[PDB]
Amino acid sequence: VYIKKVEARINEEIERVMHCLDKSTEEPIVKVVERELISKHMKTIVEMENSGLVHMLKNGKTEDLGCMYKLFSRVPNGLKTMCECMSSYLREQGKALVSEEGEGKNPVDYIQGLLDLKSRFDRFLLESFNNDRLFKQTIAGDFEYFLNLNSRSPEYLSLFIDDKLKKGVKGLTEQEVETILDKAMVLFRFMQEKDVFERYYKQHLARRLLTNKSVSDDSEKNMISKLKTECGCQFTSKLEGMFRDMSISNTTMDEFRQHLQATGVSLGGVDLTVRVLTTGYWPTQSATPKCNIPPAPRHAFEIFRRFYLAKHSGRQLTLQHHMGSADLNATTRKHILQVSTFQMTILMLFNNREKYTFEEIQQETDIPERELVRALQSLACGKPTQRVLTKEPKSKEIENGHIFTVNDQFTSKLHRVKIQTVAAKQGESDPERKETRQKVDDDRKHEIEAAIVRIMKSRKKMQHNVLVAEVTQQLKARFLPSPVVIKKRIEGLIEREYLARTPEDRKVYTY
Amino acid sequence: KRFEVKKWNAVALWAWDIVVDNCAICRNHIMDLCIECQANQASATSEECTVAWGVCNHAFHFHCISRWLKTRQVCPLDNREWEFQKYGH
Amino acid sequence: SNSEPNVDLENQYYNSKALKEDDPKAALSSFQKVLELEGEKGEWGFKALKQMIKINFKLTNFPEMMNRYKQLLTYIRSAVTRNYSEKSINSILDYISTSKQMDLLQEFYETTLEALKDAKNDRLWFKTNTKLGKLYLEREEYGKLQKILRQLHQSCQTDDGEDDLKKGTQLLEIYALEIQMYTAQKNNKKLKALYEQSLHIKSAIPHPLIMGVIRECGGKMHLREGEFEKAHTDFFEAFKNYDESGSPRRTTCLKYLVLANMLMKSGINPFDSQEAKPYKNDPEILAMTNLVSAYQNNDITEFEKILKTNHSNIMDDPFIREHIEELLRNIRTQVLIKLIKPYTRIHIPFISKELNIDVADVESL
Ligand SMILES: [Zn+2]
Ligand SMILES: [Zn+2]
Ligand SMILES: [Zn+2]
């Protein structure tokens, strides 16, 4: 209530002096009065706490913040302490939110809370501070300060954007989608460690493209355009190649449709969907496996390889076993199944002759490890009353000498029943996270060496501590200078040449 | 049969080779040194001169296209157009 | 993960899919009854509408076909995301394209255009307009191409600015259309203006064919002006894009790249790597391979013999015809310099006989 009283005091004083006196008066009296009173009472009341800035900002009082901004703008050094207190409150809130102690926190909920806090602060700024530059700079610096204390935030943002991109069930129209994407990229602007963020974005791209074929078809372009306008060129070229692969895949699809429109000699190519992807934009995953191929898939792969070596010569295909899908026409009705490129070898062995066992499908298949077990248990283990691959030894755990049969199961009226045992979770189990963290760390560790050599080859040198400043300046936009690490690393090249330092005395370099 | 495969949605990966037996800047060969090094001996230290591969799969000696990027100009096939995707054949 | 979509809708949709190979009169009725099952929207009835349009196109039933296509256009801006609807409508347009009733084809096209305008289907919309523009260029049409270009540019206009920052791909497609057009009218000034505007604002994700076309135009402009490095780089990127895509323009772009790389002097080879057993031995590229082989070997006599032997595919291009004089001058200069390096004080007629040219040309060189 003091702020309204002092504003009324200012208004009444200025009105009384302007109506009751001359023009050469006014400014001195009101100037000194407001100076002294505002300075003293501001100090006391807005740095004590009593209905202070922290409390009036926590509960969300828009009028109080607006009147405070409009009153404190007249006196110098008021906005400075206002922004300092706001930054202190933001630091406290972040430390209460970015707390690492305690396991069992939801990533998407954490990102949603951070985004809600950012949006609330932006709304308060727009409503009260009239888009002041100082407040924006202070909040940006504070976000940069409290956001880089961890390393799981970028992956959580990636999973949030994957959830927003997989389906636009929330916000069917386009305006709100555009606004939320803009807010997401604005939040990403004040974020560090872009390497792991973009790696997880590529992982989400691989997950959504190799399992879904109708993701957005219109928002992918918007996503990658925002990446172009936001990031530089490190993995944006990776995304370029990723989309180039889809373009070439559809061009190959239509030209192959023209190919089978002109005859086709034998059958086996009944209904095929072959795709062309490059190795430099889609990673292997683990090892480029060498498993077997079912017969109709064998014919399809042979035809595709012959075409690619005939009309796209100069490059050879490499076979791998991680991705794909197929429809298995089974047969009282004819229900078509779905096999994800792994159990279809077992179904090949069954097409030749069923009533096999685990030994039969592990000996005459060149089949991989426990991923085989997960693929095989899809048709038998954990199955509802639409079982298509039944066994006599009904049990949960998998045996070796167990026979497989078939049940018609007329209850399965669905003619495109699928068994989606794969893609149970998308949590990115530690192994791959750690390996890609090591990969991006090595990427940074050789990028810094490339920068230091490329710059100091076009520049001069130092005696004790001159060049470190230039490399920190040119790596300022990348990450922290890390003086100890660079100091320990620059002296490791002395056992070689390229402007070393000389073992006997570290001061004469190989110029 | 009791089961029959109808469709397939395979993913086919491919690798880039365009293997040839000639060079461009030194006019000698893909391997067996270049104009700036001639012989195998005379301070090679296991012949520190290998083959450089670009994103477009074109192949040159590392030294050849390195001096190409250094001597005449850097703009033709710069870091935006020509990448460094491999080292050695 | 899993999500129960619907059981009965899928069951009847598959029943009608099986029925489609039977008499179409019953398949259409069953598909129309699938839309009656849910009533509101469609989901599986969305695909049922597409199947009904296909079967009606089989038995030449267009009026209700277009009414139900309007229903699908309204369904695009519905619970069905505008993701698979674009592929579905591309397939419907291709199916309509099977027949030859151009009036019906363009009625379909205009209804689609207006519906997509109403649905603010920005990406889908300029994709459709770009496809229409490519069709017009393939038929050398500019009356409606100009209108489409103006509309797309206005959509790209940020009021004060004539360009956005994320509609860079939009302007990229627009400039690809205009590059094809001004290749038809060979307007050099408009070509350079387009290339400059593209280089500045186009920075975005390209489609490989579009990037290849724009880089081909840039290389043409640069080698028309005189820049050899820029033209070589542009032909390089265009030929890489053509290698990725597969367009027939790959051979012509490779020939232009071969010409450009020979003009930057300093002894570089364009047939070395990509022109291999597949491409080096290509009948249309073997002549260029032999030319650059002679260029490497500095064999002026063999080079001129190959020029005269394959003149129907060496200087046939008016541009290569223009540049053959400069190429001959450069190769003769290189041979002369190599010949006169090891010694001094050499007579002119011997050089003229070695170069198989006139004495005056030797003196001028
Ligand atoms: Zn070399
Ligand atoms: Zn050497
Ligand atoms: Zn390279």
mmCIF file of C-alpha atoms and ligand atoms in Angstrom, chain B residues 33-34 36-44 47-49 63, ligand 2:
data_model
loop_
_atom_site.group_PDB
_atom_site.id
_atom_site.type_symbol
_atom_site.label_atom_id
_atom_site.label_comp_id
_atom_site.label_asym_id
_atom_site.label_seq_id
_atom_site.Cartn_x
_atom_site.Cartn_y
_atom_site.Cartn_z
ATOM 1 C CA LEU B 33 52.857 -40.617 -54.197
ATOM 2 C CA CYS B 34 52.350 -37.288 -55.973
ATOM 3 C CA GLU B 36 55.269 -32.784 -54.333
ATOM 4 C CA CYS B 37 56.864 -35.952 -52.914
ATOM 5 C CA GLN B 38 58.088 -38.100 -55.868
ATOM 6 C CA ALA B 39 59.967 -40.958 -54.203
ATOM 7 C CA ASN B 40 59.002 -43.065 -51.179
ATOM 8 C CA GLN B 41 62.157 -42.277 -49.144
ATOM 9 C CA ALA B 42 63.794 -38.906 -48.239
ATOM 10 C CA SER B 43 62.103 -37.991 -44.931
ATOM 11 C CA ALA B 44 58.725 -39.695 -45.270
ATOM 12 C CA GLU B 47 55.133 -42.014 -45.984
ATOM 13 C CA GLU B 48 52.951 -39.353 -44.347
ATOM 14 C CA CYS B 49 50.980 -38.789 -47.566
ATOM 15 C CA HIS B 63 48.538 -33.162 -50.125
HETATM 16 ZN ZN ZN D 2 56.488 -37.802 -50.071
#
